[PDB]
Design a protein around this nucleic acid. Structure first.
Ligand SMILES: Cc1cn([C@H]2C[C@H](O)[C@@H](COP(=O)(O)OP(=O)(O)OP(=O)(O)O)O2)c(=O)[nH]c1=O
Ligand SMILES: [Mg+2]
Lengths: 1005, 218, 419
DNA sequence: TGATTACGAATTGC
DNA sequence: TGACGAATTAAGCAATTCGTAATCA
């Protein structure tokens, strides 16, 4: 015991209910501690002295204040006070569930009560005292007084950890394998013990090989075993029978690892292993509790998550292991699905997205090419990660399209050197990534010998090691520790719930500190309400520098400024006509003076009402602002840690963490506008949105048409607080620190919620950046007030605006100069959408570039641009239709599967259901799949497209286009030409072309 | 009544016409699990796996669903004790007698009531080991229950934890009730009023209520 | 699954049965429970119905227009007058037919309906007939009781009912015009009778018969008639001086009657009824300048624009007439009802219902006009949007804003004192 | 045989 | 002797693009 660092907390669901803590000491010993586990209720003193059977145990919480947080509408200024009571409260713990009539604080979990009432953090280091501990087993103690046992906290210390990464490969005939016909061919393991030793080993099924091949393999260097007791993990390749392989797997999976990590293993790998082991032998994989009092069998279970939108309906599925020994079974597939957004979530796509590096050509000739990667080619740390993955990789993708096989690999001190088998490439720098492999697995299983067995072994060991590479790339350990500390949740539950559950721990701590309880009496009513304000862009092309100004955490800061909480709302005053409106306004401005109370005007709730005012108190801080302050502090900490990072992996990890905290802070406001939530407050959400709109309008009015001359800045309007009079200066004459000879004018063009795009009549970016920095300083010092603060994001060049949320530009960061490479930025266009095409994107890119070049040159005699573009597009489309050289991969679209549809006909659900009926592999309820448009080959060019959804087909990994089938090019061509037409300026010629090519009328802006 | 042949035991499946559009798939699903399944003594006997496939489905209105047959002495037709000894049928008869007022009886059979089809999700179970054949039956179970749901109006599922995700197992929505199992300890089925709710729902869907006293055996 | 679910489903079914005979509140409750049931059972046999066009044709058939034959069983006769037809349900609102709305009814009538509903639960629906604020039980149907005692207890409750008639027939007889005249003299009432409904003991369906003939009569002029307090009834006289009655002013302004014209009319032995189903602003302005500029239309009635006064405040408050502001407080503390009703109700609402303007027109007059106030009192009013000048009744409202502001100021400074 | 509008679903930006 | 739970449910609105049904000359 003594000094322990916590690893996991978990429950036991046997005859008696317990709670378990797993920890490690300094030397490396593992310690288990067992706690009795109670049901927690909160009652008043009167209820406590009237419980018919006395409770098991009760602890006094002191005097607490109960507030009714229901909202009612008032038609005059005689507003009744909120119902507030003060009483002595008791916290009762019961071994079994009980029903108490008037118990409060019933939305919080039991584990949260354990942690908070006992003063324990799930991820801390402690110095336990043995006086309160009793030894019940070798390595397992029992604690009855967790408050005294965990009284002493100590600084963090590092501990060793153990890991198992695994993968399997199964035989198949024509499609997905089946556990009743198809055996396991390969099983690969990466094993890390508490001593730091890293072992890689692969087991090969020898039952699908000939005896001569077995003898040849043994003479080649492999080891042959006939029994489970003669297996050594220090041998790379071991061949055996299927029963021995399954027994080795069962032996490994019953150990007390800290983490067992798989990719889509809970649904395929472990399920297949368990089922095959039960079919061949009769054995089972058995998990045991730390006290050796409970035994369970491995059985994967399914959790279904439904939607909160209309009809609700199921929207996601996830699979879990039912172990009770403290080991965490982690599936990277679900984690990556919930974390980032990609086109496909197969392992190849994730590998291509994660492990990519820029490489320099060093040699050419014959059918091979040599690439080198170093810190002087891409960035700091990319070459090292690529070299780490190259230790086991077999195939490399060059220039996003070519697939090549590795011939030789060398690992250097700062990078890598690789030799690949690819055709001659005429350039100096290319992009290499780890992705798809061009092997036909079914054909390889059709004719099976020793060489294919060894190659499959290499592929399987790479698959096993990819789990570790992804585990390190995404920083799962740091995220787990931070989440356990912040959310007051066990380590195994951090990535399992949404915003409504991960804010309950901090909320309970806040409520206990403030001595406050919130209650509801009547039902909740939902009404529509408005949101952010988006300005209409003033032009399409700019050819002038644009400066981007943004707010910092706008809605959280609005909530903090206005003290917007459900319990700080004095009331809502409405009126049905102007006479009462005037009377109420005159009375309200003097009953509730500005400095302490804040009044917010809003759009009316119902058709008859013509006015609505909400009043909020600022004397006592609310509950939602304190939560927001907590999350804002966490985000600031992780931004500061990101600022000091050097390598790429650490930078990515810290960026992800700060993004997560930002999204949680915004989810708090969203919940405050969510009807089925405990923190529901319609008035507060409406007021937050109204104040945001006022703030952006204030900034835009100050910045539009503002000019600097001499060393002086003149804003357009008066710097007056749009809510009430204050003590600040209101002079639009501000002294600057810029050179005197400067003279510039600023005009606003676009804005979304908390952002302003300010155009400057200049072209150089150094001067623009300097002016922007000075403007940001002046705005923060003089224009804004209280906790409102703006940031200078970037400088945009060649800004092209299509619509209110679609633009492309070149971006220069704030810490950049003229001699720095910019960044291409697309926002909302047909290049980031996951449902457009890969043909559409390439054509859009080439034609946009050609149009920009032609506009730079400039002919426009009468209609030269339009005629040239239309002729080129017609030629390209006709050539594509006739030659049919583009593969199917350029014509695949992606979509998610769910069951949240009004009406059950719904062609999409029908398509997925039929695919699941006619195919072995099943598409699940939160899974993205590919589909395309296919038609019979003999059909000619079609003008009038009548039914389109009938032609959708699902493209699985083994799909081959038949000799009587062709891609329905017409749909894609129509979409692409509708995109192109809107960019040009002519209308008659475009309409004529569209009606000739497709026989329909186009739609314009 | 049409007969189809399979490679393994019972070598014969005879079915009503209403089950026609499923049988082919059923056969292709039974030829890959039969050899493994038939290595153990099972209740019911192999010859009585598919005896509920002779009941027409176009005249039924309610389905009462279990999860697995009795561990021992399984008759093939779900929820049946020819000698009235199993606890579940005894207690369901007690509840229905309390509802309708009949006091003197000697047996209850859910298979006689008009408009009601009793069903088991898993069609077999090892002697003494319940829920031991889930992997063999899974696909067949989903397929047959989905066919049944397409005809009935109310689906009554007995067993809270077993049917916790019944909506994920069914594509088309249907009227669903999940209740406690009869043999559940802690006396939770006594306070359940599912049968009256069934009648109310049926008459709310322009359908005839179920004569629940029709099943008593004298 | 529990008992509460059974009760909820039972009440949902009961509400589904009686849907056409339902108001907004019942419809909202039924929709809410439909949503709840769909949520908990994943599917339900009923959907959410919103429009719900009220109709009562289920219990009635086509009106006979020719003599027919009757014979078997005892017959119960209930007469039907001319007026607005209303529906009252079990513990529900008091709705219009076809255009069901929360029509304002006297509180005494509300109490009588509440007690008659609490008397027994065996009532399906009640059919009201109105004519010039004269409230009648037209029809009272039931599946268990008999249409005899219910009207007796309703009469003893404090509201009067027509003399339901019971007759016995043993021989084959022909119901014709002579028998209609006999029945007409048999009710023995001066109220306008239109049709007669005959029912039999046991049969729930009710069959009504009416006899009428066509005639052509000239229209001379339109004149208001005195039928209460600040309420007028239009009336048109004939060249021969005959009295042609009408149910509603809606009948006139939908009839599009022109000055000095001839129209068709259903003529009977005693009186006659004008036939409808022969733009709207033209008709309303035409009738407005016909009857006289000093008039206005209050929904389905006609009303004056008079100067009102403190008597027009004291009358409703059930207090003695007086002309001193201090006195208008003492009776307020003398009666608990008066002080309760002055405290609970607002100032704008009470001062509006003093002078009897309607709701909609006054509201749309206020919401397009600027005010200037000082210490909770109005001192300046001006118009901003001139569009509202299209409707002449709006000009009638504008004609007397000074009286309204005077009574508003008086009410505000008396509320400032009585609290 | 077209025009025009209305609605649901998917995806993105704050 | 003949199942229960574990596996406590869930952020907001603004804007565009596409296919199909419903309403209109
Ligand atoms: C992105 C996002 C924004 N919003 C709302 C809340 C924000 O106040 C408003 C503007 O969003 P952003 O400006 O994108 O978010 P932010 O203001 O917090 O940016 P920063 O991290 O630099 O401080 O939009 C959400 O409610 N949910 C979201 O996911
Ligand atoms: Mg911002």
């Amino acid at each position: 015991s003594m000094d322990v660092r916590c690893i996991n907390w978990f429950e036991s669901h046997g005859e008696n209910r317990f709670l378990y803590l797993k920890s490690r000491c300094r030397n490396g010993e593992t310690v288990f501690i067992r706690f009795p586990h109670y049901f927690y209720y909160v009652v008043t003193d009167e209820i406590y002295q009237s419980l018919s059977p006395p409770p098991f145990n009760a602890r006094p919480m002191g005097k607490m204040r109960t507030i009714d947080i229901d909202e009612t509408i008032s038609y005059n200024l005689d507003i009744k006070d909120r119902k507030c009571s003060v009483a002595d409260m008791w916290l009762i713990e019961e071994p079994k569930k009980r029903s108490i009539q008037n118990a409060t604080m019933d939305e919080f979990f039991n584990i949260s009560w354990f942690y908070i009432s006992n003063g324990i953090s799930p991820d801390g280091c402690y110095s336990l005292d043995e006086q309160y501990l009793t030894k019940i087993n070798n390595g397992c103690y029992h604690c009855d007084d967790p408050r005294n046992c965990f009284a002493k906290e100590i600084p963090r210390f590092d501990i060793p950890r153990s890991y198992l990464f695994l993968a399997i490969a199964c035989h198949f005939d024509k499609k997905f394998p089946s556990v009743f016909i198809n055996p396991i061919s390969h099983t690969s393991y990466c094993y890390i013990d508490l001593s730091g030793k890293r072992l890689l080993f692969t087991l090969i099924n020898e039952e699908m090989l000939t005896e001569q091949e077995i003898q040849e393999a043994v003479d080649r260097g492999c080891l042959r075993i006939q029994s489970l007791m003669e297996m050594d993990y220090e041998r790379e390749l071991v061949l055996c029978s299927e029963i021995v392989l399954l027994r080795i797997a069962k032996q490994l999976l019953e150990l007390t690892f800290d983490y067992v990590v798989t990719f889509n293993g809970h649904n395929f790998d472990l399920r297949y292993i368990t089922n095959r082991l039960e079919l061949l032998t009769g054995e089972k994989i058995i998990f045991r509790s730390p006290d050796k009092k409970e035994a369970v069998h491995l059985c994967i279970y399914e959790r279904n998550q439904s939607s909160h939108k209309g009809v609700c309906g199921m929207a996601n599925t996830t699979f879990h292991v039912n172990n009770n020994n403290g080991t965490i079974f982690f599936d990277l597939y679900s984690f990556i699905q919930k974390s980032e957004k990609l086109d496909s979530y197969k392992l190849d796509s994730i590998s291509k997205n994660a492990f990519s590096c820029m490489g320099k050509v060093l040699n050419r000739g014959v059918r091979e090419m040599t690439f080198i990667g170093d810190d002087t080619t891409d960035a700091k740390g990319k070459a090292d990660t690529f070299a780490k993955v190259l230790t086991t990789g077999n195939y490399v993708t060059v220039d996003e399209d070519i697939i090549c096989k590795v011939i030789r690999k060398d690992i250097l001190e700062n990078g890598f050197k690789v030799v690949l088998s690819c055709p001659t490439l005429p350039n100096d720098i290319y992009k290499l990534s780890f992705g798809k492999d061009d092997i036909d697995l079914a054909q390889m299983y059709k004719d099976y010998n020793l060489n294919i067995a060894l190659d499959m072994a290499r592929y399987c060991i790479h698959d096993a090691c990819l789990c570790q590479y992804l585990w390190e790339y995404y920083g799962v350990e740091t995220k787990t520790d931070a989440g356990a500390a912040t959310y007051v949740l066990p380590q195994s539950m951090v990535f399992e719930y949404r915003a409504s559950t991960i804010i309950k721990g901090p909320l309970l701590k806040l409520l206990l500190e403030t001595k406050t309880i919130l209650v509801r009496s009547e039902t909740k009513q939902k009404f529509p309400y408005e949101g952010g304000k988006v300005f209409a862009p003033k032009q399409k092309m700019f050819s002038n520098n644009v400066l981007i100004f943004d707010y910092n955490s706008l809605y959280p800061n609005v909530c903090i400024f206005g003290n917007l909480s459900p319990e700080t709302l004095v009331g809502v005053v409405v009126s049905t006509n102007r006479l009462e409106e005037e009377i109420n306004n005159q009375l309200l401005l003097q009953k509730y003076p500005p400095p302490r109370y804040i009044t917010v005007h809003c759009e009316p709730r119902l058709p008859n009402l013509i006015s609505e005012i909400a009043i909020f108190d600022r004397s006592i801080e609310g509950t939602i602002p304190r939560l927001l302050r907590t999350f804002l502090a966490e985000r600031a900490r992780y931004k500061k840690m990101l600022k000091q990072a050097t390598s790429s992996t650490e930078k990515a990890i810290y960026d992800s963490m700060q993004y997560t905290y930002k999204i949680v802070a915004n989810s708090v406001y969203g919940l405050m506008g969510f009807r089925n939530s405990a923190l529901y407050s319609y008035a507060s959400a409406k007021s937050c949105t109204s104040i945001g709109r006022r703030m952006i309008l204030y900034l835009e009015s100050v910045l539009n048409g503002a000019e600097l001359s001499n060393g002086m800045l003149r804003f357009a309007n008066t710097l007056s607080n749009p809510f009430y009079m204050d003590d600040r200066d209101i002079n639009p004459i501000v002294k600057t620190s810029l050179p005197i000879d400067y003279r510039f004018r600023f005009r606003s063009v676009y804005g979304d919620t908390d952002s302003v795009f300010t155009e400057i009549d200049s072209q150089d970016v150094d001067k623009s950046i300097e002016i922007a920095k000075e403007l940001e300083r002046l705005i923060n010092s003089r224009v804004l007030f209280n906790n409102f603060k703006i940031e200078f994001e970037a400088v945009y060049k060649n800004l092209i605006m299509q619509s209110k949320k679609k633009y492309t530009t070149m971006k220069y960061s704030a810490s950049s100069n003229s001699k720095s490479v910019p960044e291409r930025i697309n926002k909302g266009t047909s290049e980031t959408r996951r449902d457009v095409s890969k043909f559409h994107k390439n054509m859009i890119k080439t034609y946009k570039t050609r149009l920009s070049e032609m506009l730079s040159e400039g002919r426009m005699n009468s209609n030269q641009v339009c005629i040239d573009i239309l002729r080129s597009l017609e030629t390209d489309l006709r050539s594509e239709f006739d030659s049919r050289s583009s593969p199917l991969e350029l014509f695949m679209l992606s979509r998610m599967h769910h069951s949240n549809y009004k009406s059950a006909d719904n062609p999409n659900m029908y398509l997925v259901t039929e695919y699941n009926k006619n195919n072995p592999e099943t598409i699940e309820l939160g899974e993205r799949y590919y589909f395309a448009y296919i038609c019979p080959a003999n059909v000619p060019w079609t003008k009038k497209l009548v039914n389109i959804k009938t032609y959708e087909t699902i493209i699985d990994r083994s799909f081959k286009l038949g000799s009587n089938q062709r891609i329905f090019y017409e749909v894609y061509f129509k979409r692409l030409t509708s995109e192109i037409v809107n960019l040009l300026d002519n209308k008659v010629l475009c309409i004529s072309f569209f009606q000739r090519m497709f026989g329909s009328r186009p739609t314009f802006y | 009544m049409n007969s189809v042949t399979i490679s393994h035991a019972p070598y014969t499946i005879t079915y009503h016409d209403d089950w026609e559009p499923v049988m082919s798939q059923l056969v292709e699903f039974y030829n890959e699990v039969a050899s493994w399944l038939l290595r153990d003594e099972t209740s019911p006997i192999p010859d009585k796996f598919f005896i509920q496939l002779k009941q027409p489905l176009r005249n039924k209105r309610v389905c009462v669903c279990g999860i697995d047959p009795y561990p021992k002495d399984g008759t093939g037709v779900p929820f049946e004790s020819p000698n009235f000894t199993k606890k579940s049928i005894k207690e369901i008869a007690s509840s229905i007698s309390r509802l309708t007022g009949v006091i003197d009886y000697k047996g209850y059979n859910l298979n006689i009531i008009d408009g009601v089809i009793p069903w088991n999700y898993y069609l077999s179970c090892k002697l003494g080991e319940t829920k031991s054949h889930a992997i063999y039956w899974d696909k067949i179970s989903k397929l047959l229950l989905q066919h049944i749901t397409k005809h009935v109006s109310v689906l009554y599922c007995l067993g809270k934890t077993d049917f916790s995700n019944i909506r994920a197992k069914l594509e088309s929505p249907v009227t669903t009730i999940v209740g406690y199992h009869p043999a559940a300890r802690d006396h939770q089925f006594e306070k359940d009023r599912s049968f009256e709710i069934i009648n109310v729902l049926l008459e709310l869907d322009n359908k005839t209520p179920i004569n629940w006293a029709q099943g008593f055996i004298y | 699954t529990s008992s509460a679910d059974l009760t909820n489903l039972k009440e949902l079914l009961s509400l589904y049965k009686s849907l056409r005979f339902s108001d907004s509140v019942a419809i909202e409750k039924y929709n809410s429970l439909v949503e709840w049931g769909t949520s908990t059972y994943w599917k339900i046999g009923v959907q959410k119905v919103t429009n719900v066009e009220t109709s009562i044709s289920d219990y009635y058939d086509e009106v006979k227009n020719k003599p027919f034959n009757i014979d078997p069983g005892y017959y119960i006769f209930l007469p039907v007058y001319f007026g607005s037809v209303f529906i009252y349900s079990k513990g529900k609102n008091m709705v219009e037919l076809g255009s069901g709305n929360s029509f304002q009814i006297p509180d005494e009538i509300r109490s009588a309906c509440n007690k008659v509903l609490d008397s027994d639960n065996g009532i399906d629906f009640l059919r009201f007939v109105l004519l010039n604020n004269r409230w009648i039980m037209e029809d009272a149907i039931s599946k268990y009781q008999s249409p005899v005692n219910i009207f007796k207890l309703a009469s003893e409750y404090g509201l009067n009912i027509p003399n339901y008639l019971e007759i016995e027939i043993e021989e084959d007889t022909l119901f014709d015009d002579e028998l209609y005249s006999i029945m007409e003299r048999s009710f023995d009432d001066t109220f306008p009778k239109i049709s007669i409904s005959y029912i039999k003991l046991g049969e729930l369906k009710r069959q009504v018969v009416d006899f009428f003939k066509f005639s052509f009569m000239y229209i001379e002029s339109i004149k208001v008639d005195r039928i209460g307090d600040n309420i007028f009834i239009p009336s048109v006289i004939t060249k021969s001086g005959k009295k042609i009655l009408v149910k509603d002013v809606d009948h006139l302004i939908r009839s599009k009657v022109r000055e000095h014209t001839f129209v068709k009319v259903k003529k009977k032995n005693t009186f006659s009824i004008l036939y409808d189903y022969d733009t709207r602003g033209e008709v309303i302005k035409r009738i407005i300048d016909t009857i006289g500029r000093d008039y206005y239309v209050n929904g389905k009635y006609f009303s004056k624009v008079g100067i009102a006064g403190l008597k027009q405040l004291t009358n409703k408050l059930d207090i003695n007439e007086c002309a001193t502001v201090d006195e208008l407080v003492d009776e307020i503390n003398k009666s608990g009802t008066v002080k309760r009703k002055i405290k609970n109700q607002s100032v704008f609402d009470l001062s509006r219902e003093c002078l009897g303007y309607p709701e909609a027109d006054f509201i749309t007059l206020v919401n397009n006009m600027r005010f200037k106030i000082e210490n909770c009192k109005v001192v300046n009013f001006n118009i901003e949007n001139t569009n509202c000048l299209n409707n002449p009744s709006i000009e009638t409202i504008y004609g007397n804003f000074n009286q309204f502001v005077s009574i508003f100021n008086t009410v505000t400074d008396v509320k400032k004192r009585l609290f």
